[PDB]
Design a protein around this ligand. Sequence first.
Ligand SMILES: CC(C)(C)c1cc(N)c(C(N)=O)s1
Length: 209
Amino acid sequence: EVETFAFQAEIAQLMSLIINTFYSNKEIFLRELISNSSDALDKIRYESLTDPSKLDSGKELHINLIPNKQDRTLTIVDTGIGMTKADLINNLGTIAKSGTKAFMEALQAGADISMIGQFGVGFYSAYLVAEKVTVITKHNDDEQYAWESSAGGSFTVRTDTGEPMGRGTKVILHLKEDQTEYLEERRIKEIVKKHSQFIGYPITLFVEK
Ligand SMILES: CC(C)(C)c1cc(N)c(C(N)=O)s1
């Protein structure tokens, strides 16, 4: 059962602006997605202080970067709080409507795309380098779900049947044909050290075979 939804016009217009605008500093996408995972891990860590049983789906709090050249995919995994079905379908999109309006107004007044995080809509920077994004997520209170969009105005949500996650969020970036530089170990290491050196969770960069 695959459900198809339309993006809000403002979010769709944001994704077009990200996809079409000429902007060479594309490497900031990794800073934003890693920043998103750190916040998800903060939320499960805070909630587990007043409730130790929330960590029954996994005690470890970490971020893993997994490149795959055969699939041409870069996967950012965290064991954060995850997102529910309502988070994917409309909760997180409606929050982003106000940040998108402010982000677009800032752009015409002299800002650039690298400040996208300051408006809380950093996730969409993934489309700087990916033609399709797959998000697999498992919240403690909901089932495992797969979100997917190739932009163009729509996204899909379905119950995930793959490997069970326990808890967290898996962002799979199906990279563009000319963005495979972000599969290189030495390139990922440089971006992590430059933009995310003080993240308070262990970041493991996986090596390919
Ligand atoms: C599309 C989906 C549900 C993956 C997200 C939208 C927003 N705005 C996210 C965020 N981290 O802000 S995640």
